[PDB]
Enzyme design. Structure first.
Site, PDB file in Angstrom:
ATOM      1  N   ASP A  73    -113.789  32.983  -3.745  1.00  0.00           N
ATOM      2  CA  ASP A  73    -113.399  33.834  -2.620  1.00  0.00           C
ATOM      3  C   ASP A  73    -114.245  35.116  -2.597  1.00  0.00           C
ATOM      4  OD1 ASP A  73    -111.232  33.455  -0.535  1.00  0.00           O
ATOM      5  OD2 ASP A  73    -110.675  35.495  -1.141  1.00  0.00           O
ATOM      6  N   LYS A 129    -100.427  46.837  -8.535  1.00  0.00           N
ATOM      7  CA  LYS A 129    -100.518  45.617  -7.728  1.00  0.00           C
ATOM      8  C   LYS A 129     -99.234  44.807  -7.894  1.00  0.00           C
ATOM      9  CE  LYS A 129    -104.386  42.635  -6.428  1.00  0.00           C
ATOM     10  NZ  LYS A 129    -105.772  42.296  -6.819  1.00  0.00           N
TER      11      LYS A 129
END
Lengths: 252, 232
Positions: free
Chosen positions: B170, B86
């Protein structure tokens, strides 16, 4: 407050960028106190709870606030601290004066004091950009470590306001802000009643600066619709106001 | 070394690196740009070389996806074990070191407390290497064997996080990955809100409604039982 006490406190922080628990021997070398007295100074600081002995020493949260405040006092930004006039998403909002400003202290193997240092920088960077791009955000004054000093806004969060003169005006100002941000390639991601402050002249001012989503992002349409839905819901729930023409991704 | 030494004047780079044409060798390779500055491509190389130096990342990869503010690539070590890389992209650069460290710190904590999150392997600069999950994001799944089992697993995750004092903020179809055995695995943690926060009930309700909405729009499943904030 003594110049020696400050040198020792800065050294505990200096050695903390390579050690979790800074040894007293290491602090002595950074502080360079000449006629010693380092360990006597370390004893005062522990009693004052500015450092903690957990073999060496580590900087406390209270001690980190002191380092940041002293530096902002040194730059002629913060001279007096008032009362804690709120809490941010991951911060403590105090009132300061040099006139009156707002102080935001960010509170979160890696140390969290350093992460807070960057969280502050990120907020200042986003605030500096939007303000220059003539956006309704408080003017950023300065930042140091986890402390961000900005313009004090004479207003209350939208969530606290139950009666407003014209809800149509307020609604349009919030929707124009969503459009203005989108045309600048950004999506708030948390555009709601807690992040927007309504002042005496009933003008919206955004106060939360989270991680903003790009409009070029694959799921940008979903995040944009969520922000527009948030405003639509609050206005229909509180002031019982509804509108047919609301922004869509086609406006961007 | 020249790349590590790197607007920065050429004279300054020479002194840190310890000659001339090395320089346009990586300007042409777009690892640095015009004094000379480090590019986003050059920053990826620095991070990857360091993770290769630690025997974590040996091979390149095909960008399998995109995070809220990151790029997800597939990596492999000397052994051939496949992982997920990532690379954090904030749209500075030193700020991407935050999002990486913050993600690794949240992932390390949540994994140790036995939460369905990929195992964090290591981190450097804006790069976070974690366990590769054999699954697709919940947003790509249109049909599922049992929607009830999947729903319960997402709602138990919201409860489990709340009782530890955290609210995702989220929790949605893009942040959850569904594997071969149809098990939910959290892949994002950008800004977690404390339950002691004044507006924690609002953020908790938003996450719970963003599972009920998705499980109705797709799958057309609705369950009477769902989490309420006054449960902790």
């Amino acid at each position: 407050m003594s110049r020696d006490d400050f040198r020792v406190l800065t050294a505990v922080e200096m050695g903390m960028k390579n050690h979790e628990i800074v040894p007293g021997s290491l602090i002595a070398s950074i502080a360079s106190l000449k006629h010693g007295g380092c360990n006597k100074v370390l004893r005062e600081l522990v009693k004052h709870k500015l450092i903690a002995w957990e073999q060496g020493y580590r900087l406390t949260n209270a001690g980190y606030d002191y380092l940041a405040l002293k530096t902002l006092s040194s730059r002629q930004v913060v001279e007096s601290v008032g009362n804690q006039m709120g809490v941010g998403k991951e911060s403590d909002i105090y009132i300061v004066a040099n006139q009156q400003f707002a102080l935001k202290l960010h509170r979160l193997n890696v140390s969290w004091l350093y992460l807070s240092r960057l969280s502050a920088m990120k907020e200042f960077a986003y605030m500096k950009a939007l303000y220059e791009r003539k956006f309704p955000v408080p003017k950023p004054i300065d930042y140091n470590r986890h402390a961000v000093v900005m313009e004090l806004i004479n207003g209350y969060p939208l969530c606290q306001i139950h009666h407003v003169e014209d809800p149509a005006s307020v609604y349009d100002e919030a929707m124009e802000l969503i459009v203005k941000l989108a045309n600048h390639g950004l999506i708030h991601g948390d555009f709601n009643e807690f992040n927007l402050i309504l002042d005496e002249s009933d003008h919206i001012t955004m106060i939360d600066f989270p991680q903003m989503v790009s409009t070029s992002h694959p799921n940008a349409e979903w995040y944009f619709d969520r922000d527009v839905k948030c405003i639509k819901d609050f206005f229909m729930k509180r002031f019982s106001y509804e509108s047919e023409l609301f922004p869509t991704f086609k406006d961007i």
